[PDB]
């Protein structure tokens, strides 16, 4: 007596898809047909931050829009001053295979993790005057792919363990675990209020989670292949996702379905990172093409290209004031554009 | 403002201290050769690591042959889905692929061949050479001599395979054992050659998982890999 559950799941899926189809009275492209195009957007490389020895895997901006941490797989976690290009810190990591970065909103801590399955948290504002490991969060059974601070004492991490987790940094314990994904969770994005977050996994699906209740609220299944990047729309009511499809898509939490798709015929490479601009009209996405493409989030027209990297673009981040875009790459340089 | 000048000066001193440390780190990062040890659970890769050393997500082994430093990384508590965390190793000098010449229990050799195919033809691993350790050769020999082996009815093309002229059997090597092991080697070499556009090469070896020569094998293959990379870089 097991086939009955399969039949019920199929019926529930049919019900959900029918409800979504009913709700899709109109498309976003139709309603946005009448707004003025953004026009070609050109950005010059204002800064080029160099000093990492190997491919950069992650970067994160500080809340002040001036300091940014980057992780490279040479085993270093460098904190930069983007205005002056001066290095503020250079933290050597125990495991060289870091693949994620985080900057505490307060600026007091940074985090990182990777193939060691551990999220290490570093105290920057030490009384000793030197950076030291504040805490090592252990408990994931697969590589750490993303992490984001909620406060100085809470952090949400995703893993190839196929699960996401919330931690109490003081106690070092896993407050809650978010399960339901089928493949490796690759990216992660906190809402502006940090009450919800969204994750994309290697199962072509994205899920919306409740940080405190600890369950999946909605699941979005537009993509065809592994999701590599996910970002929240500044409003918090939508989020964009990128995948090996060579496509980015926009989902709305309230409509519970895809809104718009960002693809081109000559783009046949996966998307490694996505980000929005301050207003949310520009969607910036990094590609395996070594290029980053700017998309009009409402028209789906490619409004520009951030060419200039000579290898895979792995990370991409817009400052909290929207003043600049940082782009890391496998060529081991970070570039800042305006 | 004097305070602004003082802060700028302090930032510059901190930056130059950081870069003075980074240069010292770079000098050692460029002198080390990173290796990815890959294989299966039933393959004797763990025994090979044990020899080289005389909840963790990744294990690191440090060894040096002559004065060259080698940093070999073994994958620990990682799920069996490798398509994402294997992109991290696109800049190692070589991948050491350990295979057991087999003879639950299934045909492990075909899945080893498929894994080698995926590694060889992956987009990010098209520049990485593979040092192929055809391991557990004594077991293969003893099982082939007993007349109960995997090859005959799992690889029907074996029934019409003849040992190459380039084969170099050991003095006490039974002809059938050498035929079987060279067939297994050619199975991997077909995949290696079908897409070897000159950016990477495969180095097959017959190993027994307890050998003092495995270190030398890796050393010589890495020397060959980097020599060919340099020859290509300079148009020969």
């Amino acid at each position, epitope marked *: 007596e097991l086939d009955q559950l399969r039949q019920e799941a199929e019926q529930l899926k049919n019900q959900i898809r029918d409800a979504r189809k009913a709700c899709a009275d109109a498309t976003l492209s139709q309603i946005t047909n009448n707004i003025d195009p953004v026009g070609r957007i050109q950005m010059r490389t204002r800064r080029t931050l160099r000093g990492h020895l190997a491919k950069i895997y992650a970067m994160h901006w500080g809340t002040d829009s001036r300091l940014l941490v980057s992780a490279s797989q040479d085993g270093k976690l460098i904190i930069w001053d983007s205005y002056t290009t001066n290095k503020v810190h250079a933290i050597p990591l125990r495991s060289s295979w870091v693949m994620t970065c985080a900057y505490a909103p307060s600026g007091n801590y940074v985090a990182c993790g990777g193939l060691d399955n551990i999220c290490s948290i570093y105290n920057l504002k030490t009384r000793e005057g030197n950076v030291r490991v504040s805490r090592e969060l252990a408990g994931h059974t697969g590589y750490l792919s993303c992490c984001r601070f909620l406060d100085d004492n809470q952090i949400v991490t995703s893993s190839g363990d196929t699960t996401c987790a919330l931690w109490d940094i003081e106690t070092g314990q896993q407050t809650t675990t978010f399960t339901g994904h089928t493949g490796d969770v690759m990216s992660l994005s906190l809402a502006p209020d940090t009450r919800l977050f969204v994750s994309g996994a*290697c199962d072509a699906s994205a899920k919306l989670w409740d940080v405190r209740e600890g369950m999946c609220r909605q699941t979005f299944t537009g993509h*065809e292949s*592994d999701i590599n990047a996910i970002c929240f729309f500044p409003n918090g009511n939508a989020f964009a996702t990128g995948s090996d499809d060579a496509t980015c898509r926009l989902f709305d939490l309230r409509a519970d379905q895809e809104l718009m798709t960002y693809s081109h015929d000559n783009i*046949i490479c996966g998307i490694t990172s996505v980000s929005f601009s301050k207003s949310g009209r520009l969607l910036l996405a990094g590609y395996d093409d070594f290029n980053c493409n700017v998309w009009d989030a409402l028209k789906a027209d490619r409004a520009g290209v951030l060419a200039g990297h000579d290898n895979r673009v792995s990370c991409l981040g817009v400052t909290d004031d929207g003043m600049a875009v940082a782009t890391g790459s496998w060529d081991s340089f970070l570039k800042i554009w305006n | 403002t004097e305070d602004q000048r003082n802060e700028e000066k302090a930032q510059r001193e901190a930056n130059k201290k950081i870069e003075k440390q980074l240069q010292k780190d770079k000098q050692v990062y460029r002198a080390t050769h990173r290796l990815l040890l890959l294989g299966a659970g039933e393959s004797g890769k763990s025994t090979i690591v044990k020899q080289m050393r005389i909840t963790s997500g990744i294990f690191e082994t440090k060894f040096q042959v002559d004065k060259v430093n080698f940093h070999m990384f073994d994958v620990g508590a990682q*799920r069996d889905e490798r398509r994402k965390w294997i992109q991290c190793f696109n800049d190692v000098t070589a991948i050491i692929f350990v295979v057991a010449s087999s003879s639950n229990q299934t045909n492990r050799l*075909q899945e080893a061949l*498929n894994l080698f195919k995926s590694i060889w033809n992956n*987009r990010w691993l098209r520049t990485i050479s593979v040092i192929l350790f055809l391991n557990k050769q004594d077991l293969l020999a003893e099982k082939v001599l007993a007349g109960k082996s995997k090859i005959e009815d799992y690889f029907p*093309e074996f029934a019409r395979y003849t040992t190459p002229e380039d084969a170099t059997p050991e003095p006490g090597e039974d002809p059938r054992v050498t035929r079987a092991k060279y067939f297994i080697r050619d199975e991997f070499l077909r995949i290696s050659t079908a897409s070897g556009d000159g950016r990477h090469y495969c180095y097959p070896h017959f190993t027994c998982s307890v050998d003092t020569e495995n270190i030398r094998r890796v050393f010589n293959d890495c020397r060959d890999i980097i020599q060919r990379m340099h020859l290509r870089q300079y148009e020969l």
Partner: nanobody
Amino acid sequence: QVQLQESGGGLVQPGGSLRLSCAASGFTFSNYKMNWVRQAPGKGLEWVSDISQSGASISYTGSVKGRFTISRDNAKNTLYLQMNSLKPEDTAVYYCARCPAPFTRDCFDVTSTTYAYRGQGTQVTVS
């Protein structure tokens, strides 16, 4: 949503014939390499055969070549596996596995214990 459902199976006498079919949906079928994998009772997932995007390249596991024939027809987004001269040892659940990514020549995790882009599976039994 990426979805695959296999068809065909049931009881077959030894030396008999059977044609398995898979109905693919949720992705551009023509852009992906496809595989056939099977999990016999008490054993792990095995790879049987694969067919490239256009059908130009085909390979089989050595134990079924000469018996099984893999074919894809991109127009109807269906993958077939003609399998005749079945032997008792061919008893297993057969799943259809998709390539992880399009435009790609490697297939990494099709035989893994849990794979997102795999079908539910159809039982094939030989008396």
